[PDB]
Amino acid sequence: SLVNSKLSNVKFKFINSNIKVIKGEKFTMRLQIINSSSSPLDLVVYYNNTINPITLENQYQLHNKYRKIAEGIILLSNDYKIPYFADLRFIGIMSGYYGTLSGLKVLDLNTNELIEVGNGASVLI
Amino acid sequence: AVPFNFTGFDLLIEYGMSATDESCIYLKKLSIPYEVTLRRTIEVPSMDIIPLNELF
């Protein structure tokens, strides 16, 4: 549900339930941002749909993990400026169990640290 | 007919040619200043390409 920050007092949770059913169509997804109001602003999202470029069976196992992270869902409003509440906008292409869907990265525009939200899941059957 | 204009485009001018002849290249020059700015209406600052594999 929740993961804490590394730099600020910001915490990220998803108001909609982290196990959810959908077909290959569109779906609504909703994220909590609660922080301290000393600089309550300037975060950005991006989903980063590219392959992390990376034993031979593990050598084709890490690639097939990454080639379904970066090909499964697409975020239909990336670079979303946040200002608390935001409804992030995805559609998924191919089906499976996308537990800890880990592409999406928010980032603080001052002192750029790659904050990750490795939470939530989506079955597509 | 502005559709393909760079963002540094900010002015125009028209050196009109005023001809008169019998058998001669006897002309003049007539020049106009024109200032015009741009409505930056819509922009596509990024693109990316995703393939697919599911039959819907």
Query: Which chain A residues contact residue B54 at CB under 8 A?
Result: 24, 93-95
> Are A88 and A81 in contact, with CB atoms under 8 Å apart?
no
Residue that has been written with the tokens 């600052």 in this structure? B45
Q: Which of A61, A51, A60, A121 is nearest to A92 (CA)?
A: A121
Please spell the DSSP secondary structure of A60-97, one letter per residue.
HHHHHHHHHHHHHEEESS-S------EEEEEEE-S-SB
* Distance in angstroms (rounded) separating the CA atoms of residues B52 and A94: 7
B51: closest chain A residue by CA: A71
Task: Say which residues have a Cβ less than 8 Å from residue B53's Cβ, sequence separation at least 6.
Answer: A71, A93, A94
Strand, helix or coil for residue B27 = coil
User: HSE of B56 in the Cβ direction (CA atoms, 13 Å)?
Assistant: 7
User: HSE of A105 in the Cβ direction (CA atoms, 13 Å)?
Assistant: 11
Phi, psi of B13 (to 5 degrees): -150, 160
* Interface residues on A facing B, Cβ-Cβ cutoff 8 A: 24, 49, 71, 74, 93-95
Resolution value, angstrom units: 4.3
Could you tell me the two tokens for B18? 């005023």
Q: Say which amino acid occupies B13.
A: I
Task: Say which residues have a Cβ less than 8 Å from residue A16's Cβ, sequence separation at least 6.
Answer: A28, A29, A30
Q: Could B53 and A71 be called an inter-chain contact, meaning their C-beta atoms sit closer than 8 Å? A: yes
Phi, psi of A17 (to 5 degrees): -70, 140
Taking the alpha carbons at both ends of chain A, their separation in whole angstroms is: 22
As to burial, measured by CB atoms within 10 angstroms (0-12 exposed, 13-18 middle, 19+ buried), residue A84 is exposed
